[PDB]
Design a protein around this ligand. Structure first.
Ligand SMILES: O=C(/C=C/c1ccc(O)c(O)c1)O[C@H](Cc1ccc(O)c(O)c1)C(=O)O
Lengths: 121, 121
């Protein structure tokens, strides 16, 4: 769920996830996907496509178990859908941290309704 | 949908809705409800309660028509679900504006995991 996803982004990036990524670019936060603005935005595009393919569980609300071990996110077995979800969320937290160097505050709180249309996943 | 909601908040408040209201208090933005921290937060609590009566339309995804007449939000006769949805969004936009006087930036990007459990609507 968003609880686990936001915790992971905090553990990986050291950043408040809502402030930094609740509405960044065309793909981070609410409101679907759009052509990515930059590498950080592209992380969130891949993440939304990761969710789109999952079936059997709800990426928004379903909770799941994960551990922080040796400063690594380790997804608990859970059940297969929840483990795939934990893996989508892990991957985005890692991707966002990797791309902090080009994060651009201009795209924060971005105007999404003006975003170009996204290619299909 | 979130597009119409965001636009109404912008028109009423003159604030960027993602920045001011995307993660405010225990009730504004993602997740559910919780005990409200202040008046602005309580507007969002009322709004989430409003959405729970909706039958036959998705408050997040479903578009509907409204217009800005004499600096007033005017819901279009949509069908019954969408008109109610439009009325819910209008009311929260007005309430947020009416309570800008006590808006506290400290509640922005709040820790919503520790919010106390909401009372029944
Ligand atoms: O563990 C953390 C954060 C650890 C952390 C805090 C600040 C940092 O910069 C950092 O890299 C890691 O917060 C959790 C609480 C929490 C925060 C965000 C959430 O979405 C959540 O579900 C739980 C805790 O107290 O264990």
């Amino acid at each position: 769920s968003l609880f686990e996803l936001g915790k992971m982004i905090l553990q990986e990036t050291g950043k408040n996830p809502a402030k930094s990524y609740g509405a960044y670019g065309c793909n981070c936060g609410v409101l679907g996907r759009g052509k990515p603005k930059d590498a950080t935005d592209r992380c969130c595009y891949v993440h939304k496509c990761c969710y789109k393919k999952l079936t059997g569980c709800n990426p928004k609300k379903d909770r799941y178990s994960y551990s922080w071990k040796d400063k690594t996110i380790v997804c608990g077995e859970n059940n297969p859908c929840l483990k795939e979800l934990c893996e989508c969320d892990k991957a985005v937290a890692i991707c966002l941290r990797e791309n902090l160097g080009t994060y651009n505050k201009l795209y924060r709180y971005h105007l999404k309704p003006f975003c170009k249309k996204a290619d299909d996943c």
